[PDB]
Amino acid sequence: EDEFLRYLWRDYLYPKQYAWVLIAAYVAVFVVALVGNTLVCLAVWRNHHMRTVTNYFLVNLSLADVLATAICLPASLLVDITESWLFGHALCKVIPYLQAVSVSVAVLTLSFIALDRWYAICHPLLFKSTARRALGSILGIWAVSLAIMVPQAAVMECSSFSVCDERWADDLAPKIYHSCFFIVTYLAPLGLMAMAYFQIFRKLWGQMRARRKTAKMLMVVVLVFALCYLPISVLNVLKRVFGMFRQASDREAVYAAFTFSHWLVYANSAANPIIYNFLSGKFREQFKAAFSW
């Protein structure tokens, strides 16, 4: 009686429960991120008081988040289910490339917000910041991101069921590449950002009341980004630099860890508009307007 209910759980009840939760979490994030991030862009298009430097950059974060949610999220959901590539050789280069480009645009956008706030508050009359110069920064963020993520597209290969993965001729190249990737897309920008906002914090809490309502929001966006991107960033360093997760002792535990980590990246795109709702009264107003209409 008891042994049967253990194999019923193992062989049927747990796998379906797992697959249900996995698809439900991905679909919920997909819809919430698409609706939320479109309402961010519309809010600065409809409202003209909201067209500040920070908000022009926050719209660029949403464009990057939509790129990842529309194209990369479904490819990720199907790979996390089947553990195989079903989109052919071309999209095995394009989709991982667009994921990388999306991450680069996101972390560079947040960096330039911190840099703008750091000079706006801590060093006030050194550099001038306007919406016109913000659009030129935004285009430069895309140009850099599209270029620096070409080696990523270059190593992606689809090999025969098919599997999409990075192809490396030697053991040292993936170690150097993934070390640079982690430092450049995660550790150095967020460490510098942390130090910038700590100084902004000391200035505003050591025009002001408005700057405090927006700095507060900004620090939460950077903290949630750091948290959402930490599991996958660490897991890829452990795998590519420290040669971990090669033993099939618990093939499924490794899949579960990487699966949840992949979902968390996409969960961040759903999180940002929810943050602007509870920490920005101006955004909340145009969010209440969208649900009322």
Ligand X SMILES: CCCCCCCCS[C@@H]1O[C@H](CO)[C@@H](O)[C@H](O)[C@H]1O
Ligand Y SMILES: CCCCCCCC/C=C\CCCCCCCC(=O)O[C@H](COC(=O)CCCCCCCCCCCCCCC)COP(=O)(O)OC[C@@H](O)CO
**Continuous H helices in 206-250:** 208-240
Q: Which parts of 149-263 are beta strand (E)?
A: 156-159, 163-166
| Residue 104 sits in the site that holds ligand X (CB under 6 A) | no
Total of chain residues touching ligand Y, rule CB under 6 A: 13
Q: How far apart are alpha carbons 116 and 195 in whole angstroms?
A: 14
Do residues 67 and 104 lie in contact, with contact meaning Cβ atoms separated by under 8 Å?
no
| Residue 151 sits in the site that holds ligand Y (CB under 6 A) | yes
Closest Cα to residue 262, out of 34, 25, 90?
25
Cα-based distances in Å from 57 to 15, 44, 81, 208, 285: 42, 11, 35, 21, 20
Choose the stretch contacting ligand X; rule: CB under 6 A; options: 153-161, 208-216, 225-233, 257-265.
153-161
Q: Which of 64, 75, 228, 270 touches ligand NVH (CB under 6 A)? A: 75
| Residue 139 sits in the site that holds ligand X (CB under 6 A) | yes
Angle at 191 between CA 129 and CA 200, to 5 degrees: 45
27, HSE (Cβ side, Cα atoms, 13 Å): 6
Total of chain residues touching ligand X, rule CB under 6 A: 21
| Residue 239 sits in the site that holds ligand X (CB under 6 A) | no
Residue 277 marked as a ligand binder? no
Q: Which of 99, 214, 268, 277 touches ligand NVH (CB under 6 A)? A: 99
| Residue 255 sits in the site that holds ligand X (CB under 6 A) | no
Site residues, ligand Y (CB under 6 A): 147-148, 150-151, 154-155, 173, 176-177, 180-181, 184-185
Site residues, ligand X (CB under 6 A): 86-88, 133, 136-137, 139-140, 144, 154-155, 157, 167-170, 173, 175, 241-243
Site residues, ligand NVH (CB under 6 A): 72, 75-76, 79, 95-96, 99-100, 103, 152, 164, 181, 185-186, 229, 232-233, 236, 265
